[PDB]
Amino acid sequence: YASLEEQNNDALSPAIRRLLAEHNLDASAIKGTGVGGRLTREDVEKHLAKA
Numbered sequence: 001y002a003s004l005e006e007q008n009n010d011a012l013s014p015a016i017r018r019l020l021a022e023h024n025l026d027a028s029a030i031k032g033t034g035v036g037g038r039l040t041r042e043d044v045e046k047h048l049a050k051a
Contacts (some may be wrong), residue, residue, distance in 0.1 A: 001014075016041065018042065025044070030043050031043055
């Protein structure tokens with residue numbers, strides 16, 4: 001953390017949406033099976049590579 005309320009690990013980021021364009025990949029081949037259609041990162045993970 002870095003403050004009094006600040007928590008530990010964070011989460012994802014806004015770019016998570018434009019991330020499809022950053023790599024020039026269409027979600028057409030991917031599927032957002034999130035709890036609410038919310039395209040998660042566990043769906044695009046099995047498509048890119050390692051990190």
